[PDB]
Design a protein around this ligand. Sequence first.
Ligand SMILES: OC[C@H]1O[C@H](O[C@H]2[C@H](O)[C@@H](O)[C@H](O)O[C@@H]2CO)[C@H](O)[C@@H](O)[C@@H]1O
Ligand SMILES: [Cl-]
Ligand SMILES: [Cl-]
Length: 373
Amino acid sequence: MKIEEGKLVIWINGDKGYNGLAEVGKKFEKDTGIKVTVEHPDKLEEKFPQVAATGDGPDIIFWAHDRFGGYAQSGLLAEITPDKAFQDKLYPFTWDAVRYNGKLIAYPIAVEALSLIYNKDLLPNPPKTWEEIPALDKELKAKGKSALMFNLQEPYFTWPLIAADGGYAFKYENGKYDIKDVGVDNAGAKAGLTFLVDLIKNKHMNADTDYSIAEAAFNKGETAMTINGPWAWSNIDTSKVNYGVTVLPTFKGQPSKPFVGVLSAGINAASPNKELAKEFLENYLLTDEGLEAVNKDKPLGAVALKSYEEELAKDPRIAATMENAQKGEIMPNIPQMSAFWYAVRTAVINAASGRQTVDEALKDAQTRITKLS
Ligand SMILES: OC[C@H]1O[C@H](O[C@H]2[C@H](O)[C@@H](O)[C@H](O)O[C@@H]2CO)[C@H](O)[C@@H](O)[C@@H]1O
Ligand SMILES: [Cl-]
Ligand SMILES: [Cl-]
């Protein structure tokens, strides 16, 4: 689909509320005459650089903020310059996540953090620790159930455990990330992934489990727990599993530390519709009504808009989200995050499969990330 003056094309990931977003687009069109088309292509975060230059891309792109520094480095993102009245409507820490080399490069939408989701009927008192999960699984196995299933194919979901005892991406000191100081093969990182691989070795998890398999198992009442973000809650509502949302398990006494993402809306620097895009985002999406439409489709998490978040904060699933966020850390947005995620993806998949030892998988990932910085 070709970008065109007088229409808006929006890209957002397939696990988000694109139908709720399309409803906001319908209100925009009712007021302005401007058609808004929402798409959720596969690997949209990887396709965006090419199509921006060829003309086949979106006016507006949604992703977690960690991807946006690499986009800005390549010139792909229009600078965002809201008036103070609008800026004041969103939490300052969300604007911080979309600031890159002194410019705002997107609008923040909502704060995402993984939580432990658990079946209250199978497991009224979920474990506080990772160490408790093997024996819990053993008991559940004798009932033809399992303790825990989550996506092992995306490193996003395993990172809270790796980080718990000391793993980190890039060392952060005095407001700057030291791209030479990577923490993916330190003792903390090794201990977390070793624990995960030992679960697999002892048949308390399966190396092959992905997003679909874990969501299906939890929503069919086959596993007592999953790890996932707020977007998953609506499919769980539909299944009417009785579920809670709670703090992630500790490891070696330390909290799991999920990498926190700010879902953000960037404007294609080459869009012929930059003003319309700002008009849509500031006056239609980032309002109580616009976010509620999306949120009702797939829950956004802790939205960046203060007025609406004051309502959402009363939901215990949102408070659990923010507690896990506070124990974790905001992702960097620096361009090196792409290589970080690719290298750690390989390391988790190879360690979990037994293709490599934990120590060699993380050492190779550490080396790749460092040499590429
Ligand atoms: O697994 C590496 C990717 O992790 C995050 O992607 C998250 C994203 O924040 C969340 O909204 C989405 O729905 O789940 C994915 C994991 O599949 C980073 O935002 C990505 O840049 C990383 O590639
Ligand atoms: Cl610009
Ligand atoms: Cl417990």
